[PDB]
Amino acid sequence: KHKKVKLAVLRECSNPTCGAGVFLANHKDRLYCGKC
Amino acid sequence: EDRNKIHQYLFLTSKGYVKTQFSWQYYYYTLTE
Amino acid sequence: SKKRKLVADGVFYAELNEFFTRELAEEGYSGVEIRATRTQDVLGENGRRINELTLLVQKRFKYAPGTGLSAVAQAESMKFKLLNGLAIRRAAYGVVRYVMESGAKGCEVVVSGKLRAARAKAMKFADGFLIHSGQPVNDFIDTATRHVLMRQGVLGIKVKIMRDPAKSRTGPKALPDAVTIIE
Amino acid sequence: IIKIRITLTSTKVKQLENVSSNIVKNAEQHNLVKKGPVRLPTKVLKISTRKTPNGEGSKTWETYEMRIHKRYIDLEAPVQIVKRITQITIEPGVDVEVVV
Amino acid sequence: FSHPRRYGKGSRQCRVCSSHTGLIRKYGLNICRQCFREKANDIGFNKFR
Amino acid sequence: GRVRTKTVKRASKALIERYYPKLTLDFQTNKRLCDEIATIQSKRLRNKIAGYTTHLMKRIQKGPVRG
RNA sequence: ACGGAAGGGCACCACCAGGAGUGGAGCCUGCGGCUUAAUUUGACCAACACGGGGAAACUCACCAGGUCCAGACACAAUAAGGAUUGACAGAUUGAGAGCUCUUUCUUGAUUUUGUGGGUGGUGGUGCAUGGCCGUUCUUAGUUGGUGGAGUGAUUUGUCUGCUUAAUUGCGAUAACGAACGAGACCUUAACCUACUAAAUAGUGGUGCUAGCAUUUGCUGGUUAUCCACUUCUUAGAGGGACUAUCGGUUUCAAGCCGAUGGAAGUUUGAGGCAAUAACAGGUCUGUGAUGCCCUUAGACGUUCUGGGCCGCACGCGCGCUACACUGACGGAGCCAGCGAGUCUAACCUUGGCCGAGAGGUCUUGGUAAUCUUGUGAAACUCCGUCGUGCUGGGGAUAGAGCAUUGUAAUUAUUGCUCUUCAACGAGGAAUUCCUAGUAAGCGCAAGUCAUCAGCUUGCGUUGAUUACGUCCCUGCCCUUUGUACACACC
Ligand SMILES: [Mg+2]
Ligand SMILES: [Mg+2]
Ligand SMILES: [Mg+2]
Ligand SMILES: [Mg+2]
Ligand SMILES: [Mg+2]
Ligand SMILES: [Zn+2]
Ligand SMILES: [Zn+2]
């Protein structure tokens, strides 16, 4: 039951293969990217 | 691109341009005119 | 090894035999040597069909780019006839007559299954001279067993063709019990 | 001249002997020296199995065997008289390997 | 999603009908006990004794 | 037992009905000529034919036999 | 066709004459019964070491739980400010499982949603099948042409007799002449001082020679050490046996039995192939073989964890240990055969080193008549201990410890060591297999395998007894006979 909320109309880390679009989510101590 | 890779490796299973023969597990595919 | 290698080679011939039986059926396939009844639908569009077939077999077996009287053909042909629609007895009669009149010394066509929905009896159609158990059955008998799949059940066809021992052209030329005297 | 040893292996005795005698004769008229064809024992690949595709009926077994056999001949010849006789044996069913 | 199956009955399957039972692991056939006896002529295995 | 079938009896009788000023009552010299006066496809069948011809023409001096 | 009808004949799946037994005890396996969550399922001469079923995961279809789309495709209600997938950190759970919840990150026309249609199923029907096999059948039967008997269906041929393993024949005879099966055929095991050829086999003789011994004799190895050869071995072609010869017995002979020779005289031994056909025999749990029915995203599909097939008041079958003195135990002799054994890689293992043992380690030989292997196997044989006892037979059961295989050894996988040593004192009615290299005793190779034999398939070694027949027992075949059966005694 993954929902994938619509994410209606609205920085960068190591492994530069990501194109400067990996803005982190500010919950706590969130220095870990989505990819890893 | 994830299907373009295989469709350029060629030179979809039901639309056409595919003949499927099984012959012990090896899914013999060929194209059609 | 060599023992395992040649066993694998025989298995390889098995995949060729079955694959050509399934693929080249509509074009009259008889046996891997390609031996087909007609060699124009084999070539197709001036080599397209043979090129694609050899490409497929090469890619399957990991190769480089360049590395009438037969019971099997008769059974495939009559399976096609019975599948596209024809009286089973009439088709068996036609195949048997063709075989027996084309120099063959005997034929038998056995149809088992639900011909018409019933207790599925098995009816034979035998004409000519017929040999049974003994080395002659290996020497000169061609046998083919095929499964016809129509809208109701399965029909098993067993076709046995005897080529004339007199025109053997290889091996024994008469029957083991055949004796011919001259004076 | 270079030294070679040809080994012939096959299942069908008639064509295997045709090759084993064709090579001997075609060395003969070319006047080579060779030790006669050594006939290694025939390997019967007996495989036992069950006749029934299931477990019903009287216990009856089916025995298969694929008789495989083999010969080897050693001789000496130049590269031309090696290749021109190596390319003669193309008979289907008999495999030949040449060691140097 | 897949635990190791490099050995045992599940590791190898019959090359003909994908059956895991009755497989003959001899001479490199890897053919099931019915499939081999059916297609024995094409491999060269014949009955003489 | 040691009974000879029709494929032996008929062939021996056919040999004798046209080969009397011919093969004697010794099996060794019967089989050798049966080799070229019969296209027998088996060595032991040929030997059976020669043996039964030997028996038949061994008894033929004790009276004619039918067939 | 059938008969709870008769007569002939056949058969160690029957007996007579016998041997090994089994049923008597223990253990291993299968089935039943019971139990359970499941103890999966099919099968009752012709099921019950069978589905090559010796199941820790898989196998598996059974159960207690958890994920996955592996739902193609013209097709519509979802799109270019977003149709969908993916997620580490926490609750969750066996789970580093984003399976579910806090949760906001990524990719961007694949997918996902509602209808249609596919797909798979070890899901059901063997009484819907094909095929394959089993049984009738380790039995001998089946059918034209011409002619003959009948209006005819049909019948003779295809048989009163004798012989054979045989409808194998002889023979008699409205039959003659034949055809399929049997036989013939083929594979293998026997021999051939012969044809051919062999550092992938062996033997002779020379050096290279160590020993015994030295008048040159014996035994040994000389893996690039030399030549010759095929007696041993191998495998191609052929040969030989054809009951050959001779007697007795044969109705008239087919044949039978003796003696001789022969390599072998029972189809020379054993087998492969096995016709007309019939089963509601078995198998949908082999098939991407399949008809039909059921299910298909809360899946009977696939995948992961664990459990299950093993489970125990009880009966039965296939097997082993034996129940001892022909034995048991120590040493010593080292005598086979059929096979099998790894190059994208981990198999067959020789030889050293370690350990009591299993086993480990460094390599070497082997893709193989090349190395395992000469399978230095067992039973067995020589010499000794045990001396007739629940004994030192027996190794059931259990306790303790060490390793191998395996992601995972607990419900011991298995191997090894020590240790209480249980029933069994030769077996009940009954019942199974078998006639010469056969039974029995014995182990070996392969199959099942990552490992595990008591299993099976092949093999060799030691190797008897009794019989050379009969229809009393059982079953089958043929003939006759009765039928109101014909879907044929369901
Ligand atoms: Mg026969
Ligand atoms: Mg399932
Ligand atoms: Mg009649
Ligand atoms: Mg069980
Ligand atoms: Mg078993
Ligand atoms: Zn990143
Ligand atoms: Zn298969």
CA trace torsion D10, D12, D18, D23 (10° rounding): 0
Mention the CATH class of domain D1-91.
alpha beta
Distance from CA of C148 to the nearest CA of B (A): 18
Q: Decide if C45 touches F, using CB distance below 8 A.
A: no
What 3-state DSSP class applies to D75? strand
Q: How was this structure determined?
A: cryo-EM
The single-letter DSSP state of residue C58 is: H
Longest CA span, chain C = 63
**Structural domains of chain C in order of their starting residue, each with its CATH number:** 10-67 (3.30.300.20), 71-167 (3.30.1140.32)
Pick from D50, D53, D65: which is nearest to E48 by CB? D65
Parent domain of E26 = 1-49
Q: Measured between alpha carbons, how far is A29 from F57 in angstroms, rounded to an integer?
A: 118
Q: Measured between alpha carbons, how far is C80 from C78 in angstroms, rounded to an integer?
A: 5
CATH T-level fold of F6-61: Diphtheria Toxin Repressor; domain 2 (1.10.60)
Q: Do E45 and D51 count as a contact with CB atoms less than 8 A apart?
A: no
By the 8 A CB rule, do F40 and F52 touch? Answer: no
Report the candidate in C15, C9, C50 with the shortest Cα–Cα distance to residue C32.
C15
Domain ranges of chain D: 1-91
Q: Measured between alpha carbons, how far is D71 from D95 in angstroms, rounded to an integer?
A: 11
Q: Do C4 and E42 count as a contact with CB atoms less than 8 A apart?
A: no
What 3-state DSSP class applies to C52? helix
Distance G371 C1' – F24 CA (angstroms): 61
- In whole angstroms, how far apart are CA C148 and each of C51, C77, C108, C153, F48? 30, 11, 18, 9, 49
What phi and psi values does residue D86 have, to the nearest 5 degrees? -70, -30
- In whole angstroms, how far apart are CA E27 and each of C30, D6, D68? 28, 24, 13
Q: Measured between alpha carbons, how far is C156 from D51 in angstroms, rounded to an integer?
A: 20
Instruction: Give the β-pairing of D47-50 and D61-64.
Output: antiparallel
Q: Decide if E24 touches B, using CB distance below 8 A.
A: no
Cross-strand pairs, D8: D71, D96
Residue D34 CA from chain centroid, whole number: 18
User: How many structural domains does chain E have?
Assistant: 1
Domain ranges of chain F: 6-61
What CATH number does residue E37 fall under? Answer: 4.10.830.10
By the 8 A CB rule, do D96 and D82 touch? Answer: no
Q: Do C6 and D11 count as a contact with CB atoms less than 8 A apart?
A: yes
What 3-state DSSP class applies to C95? helix
Where on strand G do bases come within 7 A of a protein Cβ? 42-43, 45-48, 50-53, 57-60, 67, 72-74, 81-89, 98-107, 110, 118, 122, 128-135, 163-166, 168-171, 178-188, 196-200, 234-237, 239-246, 253-257, 266-268, 270-283, 286-292, 303-305, 338-342, 367-369, 406-408, 446-450, 456-458
Q: Measured between alpha carbons, how far is E38 from A36 in angstroms, rounded to an integer?
A: 53
By the 8 A CB rule, do D54 and D9 touch? Answer: no
Q: Quick count: other Cβ atoms within 10 Å of Cβ D19?
A: 21
With 0-12 / 13-18 / 19 or more C-beta atoms within 10 angstroms meaning exposed / middle / buried, residue B9 is exposed
